[PDB]
């Protein structure tokens, strides 16, 4: 297994740029997934002690980002290792 | 260990010896039956007491008999 | 002759005999209902 | 970096039970400290006196109670398992020193966890 930690560098920029496309409107904004997700952490780390509720869409921006990131980086391992 | 005995009504068919998965039994020369051979149980230290030998014995009643005795690593069939 | 041998097999004759038996008992209770004594 | 063998046995090698140089007592002591410290947690927060003034005391005493049973268990194991006696852990003398280490460690570790929660309540 060649490893090469640069797979993680491509996994971030590769997914983030693809996820930063402008969407329609609701429970996202129209900016994108990342722009909503990076805005969700900004207004949550502002109140560092008191964490999010189940009502908050942060939990959706977390799962759909990570389940997209983990998908893009796992398929990143197979590609670099198995040319 | 288990005790395996061969009684005189043994017809020397070899079926018990063929059935034994532990090689406990063997056929020995004997004038007592037409087959000219009798089952023997020389290696009963290896006998697990599965009674495949008795299942195979065609005589009524059995000519080979397994008396389950004191358990050992070998007789309990333990690979640990 | 082979069909008749089949119809003489245990389960067929048992089915037909117990059908006939059940029919007689059912029909006796249809015409003589609620017989608690002779 | 193999992961299965290299990182596994590399990590395991540095654990107090396996680490080269340690006397049975210091292996025990390190194992004790680690266990005593975390073992107080469930008793403090989920025990029958968790919503009383005795929440923390009850939690500490319970942990010491459990640790005593574990140490007695250790001693019984060693007595039964090791008829032979030597300085190494897997021996009558070594296992008793390990047990002594574990008990001191775990009572101290428990005590230390109790001290920090009182310090930073």
């Amino acid at each position: 297994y060649p490893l090469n930690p640069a797979v993680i560098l491509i996994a971030i920029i590769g997914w983030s740029a693809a996820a930063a496309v402008p969407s329609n409107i609701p429970v996202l904004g129209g900016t994108g997934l990342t722009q909503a997700f990076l805005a969700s952490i900004q207004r949550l780390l502002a109140q560092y002690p008191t964490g999010p509720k189940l009502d908050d869409p942060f939990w959706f921006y977390l799962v759909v980002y990570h389940v997209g990131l983990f998908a893009l980086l796992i398929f990143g391992q197979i590609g670099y290792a198995g040319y | 260990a288990h005790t395996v005995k061969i009684y005189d009504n043994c017809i020397g068919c070899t079926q018990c010896v063929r059935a034994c998965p532990l090689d406990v039994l063997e056929m020995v020369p004997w004038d007592g039956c037409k087959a000219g051979q009798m089952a023997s149980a020389p290696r009963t230290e290896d006998c697990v007491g599965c009674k495949r030998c008795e299942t195979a014995c065609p005589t009524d009643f059995l000519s080979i008999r397994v008396y389950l005795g004191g358990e050992t690593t070998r007789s309990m069939g333990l690979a640990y | 002759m082979n069909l008749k041998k089949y119809l003489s097999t245990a389960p067929v004759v048992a089915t037909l005999w117990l059908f006939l038996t059940a029919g007689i008992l059912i029909e006796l209770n249809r015409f003589y209902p609620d017989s608690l004594f002779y | 970096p193999i992961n299965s063998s290299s990182l596994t046995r590399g990590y395991l090698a540095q654990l107090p039970i396996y680490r080269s140089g340690l006397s049975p007592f210091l292996r025990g002591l390190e194992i004790g400290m680690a266990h005593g410290y975390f073992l107080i947690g469930p008793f403090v927060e989920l025990g029958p006196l968790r919503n009383t003034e005795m929440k923390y005391l009850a939690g500490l005493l319970s942990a010491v109670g459990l640790v005593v049973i574990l140490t007695l268990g250790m001693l019984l194991y060693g007595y039964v398992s090791f008829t032979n006696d030597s300085q190494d852990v897997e021996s009558l003398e070594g296992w008793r020193q390990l047990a002594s280490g574990f008990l001191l460690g775990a009572v101290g570790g428990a005590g230390f966890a109790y001290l920090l929660i009182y310090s930073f309540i």
Binding site: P26 | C50, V66 | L3, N29 | -
Partner: protein
């Protein structure tokens, strides 16, 4: 390459072998000397790969036997339609779906059994049915008894054709092995031809018959006054009145102006407020979308024209560095073993029956199903049981594959071989997970029983004490509630009201509403996780150790089904793969019993019930699940004891058959324990004394009486245990829900 090749006039049609019991087996053909032979005849009758070594001859029996099964299914369906036509209140029920109880079984007046002809309404007396046939037939647009009669006759003609085809493809035109091994062709045809065209042609029925009939029924038109289905096809103006898109005809389909069919093909979600069923315009569109998917899917596999995938090439390509030769060999395994295929197919069909159970209660697909609580409870429970049995069967056939069909040459360093090579790691970890799940799921109930009994309600796992909120399930409910207009932009309403949003009522009765998950729901879900992991432990252990263990190194030679390898090695009772299936059945029974009890109680407590004019929900068991379902005592008292009231008070009423069957089923269950707890050695010795008495009176039979085999004792035991246990719940459920629902 893909060709039809058959042998002609391969088996003469003669009654000769009918008069020769056990002709099919070399061991049985000689006939009985003992009663064991009679059982063996039946146990072996369908074990075709034991009769002959020829894969061709096995395949041909299977294909022909399958037609026998379809023939029987057609007789059964025909029966259901004929009973609907002749002995039902279906026509009356169409005019009052909420008021009349569906009934399609009338009992004869004999020995007082006519008490079972219940006051169901619609001018008949009969047994209330829970199969949901009326809701199915109403969804299909059936309004009169002629339509049901003609379907029943059609069914008998299909049964006849299936019998002819079974006979024909065994006796006259038997396909060769190479015909059956056309898996690529079979999958193209089954995907595009069976599922694709099935769904397309059904969508056709829905758009042309179901839609117009149900729209007029839902508007309140008298079913007799509704135009017959063919009038909607003949007169397009009739159809255009109901769905204006029919003005534009098929021009919008060929021109890709598909939005014109927004009236007939919708994405409304939710339920009809009239019927409490899925919108049939949603269902018609679903079936169109599925049909396309399946017709497209069935172009995947290479047949006679170069294009398409080799399933062999696909399997062999899916090879990584952690899984050796990967899926190499599996194409050979699945083209040479019927049991391998039956293993997969039962796993998926069984798992499908369970998915169907969950989807059909929560998204009630049929009109007036949701508020027919007997039907809802019956359909969920039924499809759970069928699913459970199929999954255990998957275990049986996976293990039969391992004993009879597995070769190390085919499975060399492939995923199957590699699994066998760490069976100890697999089973040790699953064992551990079963102990972890059992202690931390069932332990919570025992903790709770103990704390409640000790007067320590504040020390319990409950919504009001130590809360275990199923926060992930709660979070998923929220996402599904927020879906319409958001992540499902064109969906007007939720897939299911089970997830959130509104309470749907039909009359006063609740069709569906949000199913709130709390501590009681968290706890029972971990029981389900637990009971499923253990069942998997038993069946998977059966498969991975089918051929050998450290205990029995030559287990494959002893076969799939054998009682033991004797009392030695400490005792080897129930080492066989068959005995794992035997044990798997009890755990499946355990697992699914708790599922259908969870369902029954949760739905009665928190979902089903009445909504007043004020608009206050009164549930059947008034929300007792949250505080009662967190202790075993609560299950015993507030579920079994409380809800058994209906079945045990049923004597002298139309539900008395359920009371009788409740006791009858308890009897059969208890009777099973005689077989499960005993051994044939006792029974053979008892029979010796009974045989002595017959010999004394010169009335001993030539067919020597034998105690059942060790294996048959177990088979009889588990069969009566399951029959008794399941039939008990059946009587309990139907008596309960027909009374209170």
């Amino acid at each position: 390459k893909v060709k039809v090749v058959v042998d002609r006039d391969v088996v003469a049609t003669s009654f000769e072998k009918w008069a020769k019991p056990g002709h099919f087996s070399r061991s049985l053909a000689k006939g009985p000397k003992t009663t064991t032979w009679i059982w063996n005849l039946h146990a072996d009758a369908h074990d075709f790969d034991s009769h002959t070594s020829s894969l061709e001859e096995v395949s041909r029996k299977i294909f022909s036997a399958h037609f026998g099964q379809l023939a029987i299914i057609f007789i059964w369906l025909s029966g259901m339609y004929f009973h609907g036509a002749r002995f039902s209140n279906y026509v009356a029920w169409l005019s009052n779906p909420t008021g009349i109880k569906p009934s399609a079984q009338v009992v004869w007046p004999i020995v007082g059994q006519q008490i079972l002809n219940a006051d169901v309404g619609g001018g008949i007396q009969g047994i209330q049915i829970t199969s949901g046939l009326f809701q199915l037939w109403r969804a299909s647009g059936i309004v009169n008894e002629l339509q049901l009669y003609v379907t029943a006759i059609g069914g008998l003609v299909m049964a006849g054709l299936m019998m002819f085809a079974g006979w024909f493809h065994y006796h006259k035109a038997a396909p060769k092995l190479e015909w059956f091994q056309n898996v690529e062709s079979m999958l193209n045809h089954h995907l595009a031809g069976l599922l694709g065209l099935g769904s397309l042609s059904w969508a056709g029925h829905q758009i042309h018959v179901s839609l117009p009939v149900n729209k007029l029924l839902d508007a309140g038109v008298a079913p007799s006054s509704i135009p017959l289905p063919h009038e909607f096809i003949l007169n397009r103006n009739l159809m255009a009145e109901l769905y204006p898109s029919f003005q534009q005809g098929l021009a919008p389909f060929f021109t890709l102006n598909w939005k014109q069919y927004s009236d007939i093909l919708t994405f409304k979600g939710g339920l009809s407020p009239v019927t409490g069923g899925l919108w049939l315009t949603d269902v018609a569109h679903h079936h169109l979308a599925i049909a396309v998917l399946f017709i497209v899917a069935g172009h995947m596999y290479r047949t006679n024209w170069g294009i398409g995938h080799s399933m062999k090439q696909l399997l062999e390509a899916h090879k990584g560095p952690l899984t050796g030769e990967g899926h190499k060999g599996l194409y050979e395994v699945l083209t040479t073993s019927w049991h391998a295929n039956l293993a997969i197919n039962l796993a998926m069909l069984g798992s499908l029956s369970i998915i169907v159970a969950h989807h059909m209660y929560s998204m009630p697909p049929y009109p007036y199903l949701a508020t027919d609580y007997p039907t809802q409870l019956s359909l969920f429970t039924h499809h759970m049981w069928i699913g459970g049995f199929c999954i255990v069967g998957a275990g049986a056939h996976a293990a039969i594959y391992m004993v009879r069909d597995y070769s190390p040459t085919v499975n060399y360093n492939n995923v199957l071989d590699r699994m066998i090579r760490h069976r100890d790691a697999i089973i040790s970890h699953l064992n551990w997970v079963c102990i972890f799940l059992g202690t931390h799921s069932f332990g919570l109930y025992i903790h709770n029983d103990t704390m409640r009994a000790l007067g320590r309600a504040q020390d319990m796992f409950s919504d009001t004490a130590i809360q275990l909120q199923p926060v992930l399930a709660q979070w998923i409910q929220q996402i599904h509630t927020l879906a319409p207009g958001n992540t499902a932009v064109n969906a007007l309403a939720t897939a299911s009201y089970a997830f959130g949003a509104d309470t749907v009522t039909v009359g006063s009765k609740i069709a569906m509403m949000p199913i709130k998950l709390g501590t009681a729901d968290f706890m029972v879900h971990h029981i389900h996780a637990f009971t499923i992991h253990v069942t998997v432990l038993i069946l998977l252990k059966g498969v991975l150790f089918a051929r050998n263990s450290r205990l029995i190194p030559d287990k494959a030679n002893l076969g799939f089904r054998f009682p033991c390898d004797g009392p030695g090695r400490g005792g080897t009772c129930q080492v066989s793969a068959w005995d794992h299936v035997f044990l798997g059945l009890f755990w499946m029974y355990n697992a699914l019993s708790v599922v259908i009890f969870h369902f029954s109680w949760k739905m009665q407590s928190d979902v089903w019930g009445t909504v007043s004019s004020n608009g206050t929900v009164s549930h059947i068991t008034g929300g007792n699940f949250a505080q009662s379902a967190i202790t075993i005592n609560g299950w015993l008292r507030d579920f079994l004891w409380a809800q058994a009231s209906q079945v045990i008070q049923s004597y002298g009423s139309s539900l008395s058959a359920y009371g009788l069957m409740f006791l009858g089923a308890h009897f059969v269950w208890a009777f099973s324990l005689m077989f499960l707890f005993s051994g044939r050695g006792y029974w053979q010795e008892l029979i010796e004394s009974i045989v002595w008495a017959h010999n004394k009176l010169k009335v001993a039979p030539s067919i020597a009486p034998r105690a059942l085999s060790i294996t048959q004792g177990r088979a009889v035991g588990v069969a009566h245990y399951l029959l008794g246990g399941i039939a008990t719940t059946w009587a309990f459920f139907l008596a309960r829900i027909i009374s209170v629902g």
